Write a protein that binds this ligand. Structure first.
Ligand SMILES: *[C@@H]1O[C@H](CO)[C@@H](O)[C@H](O)[C@H]1NC(C)=O
Lengths: 48, 48
């Protein structure tokens, strides 16, 4: 809920992280949108 | 005639979550494409 310079497994970027309603299948780690960009990510240390 | 952006106000607390998945308008907005409102409202055009 705060603006941060994140890095998940080398996916560097800037934004706000928030608990999603998205339901990623076990083999997926990144979710993307129409503009070809990750808008959802699985947190490696907790799998949320 | 259906319309979407209508150049009217968006809070920063609606698109996050499921919306920006289903709705292209904030996909466009999250990339610097901005629809602006007309100077006359539909009430002023109807009044004239
Ligand atoms: C990740 O590793 C840390 C350090 O060993 C551990 O405390 C933590 O419980 C681990 N993650 C989970 C979800 O168990």
């Amino acid at each position: 809920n705060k603006c941060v310079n994140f890095n998940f497994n080398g996916l560097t970027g800037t934004g706000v992280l928030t608990e999603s309603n998205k339901k990623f299948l076990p083999f997926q780690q990144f979710g993307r949108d129409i503009a070809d960009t990750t808008d959802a990510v699985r947190d490696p240390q907790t799998l949320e | 005639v259906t319309l979407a952006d209508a150049g009217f106000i968006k809070q920063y607390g609606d698109c996050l979550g499921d919306i920006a998945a289903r709705d292209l308008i904030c996909a466009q907005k999250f990339n610097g494409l901005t629809v602006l409102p007309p100077l006359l409202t539909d009430e002023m055009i109807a009044q004239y």
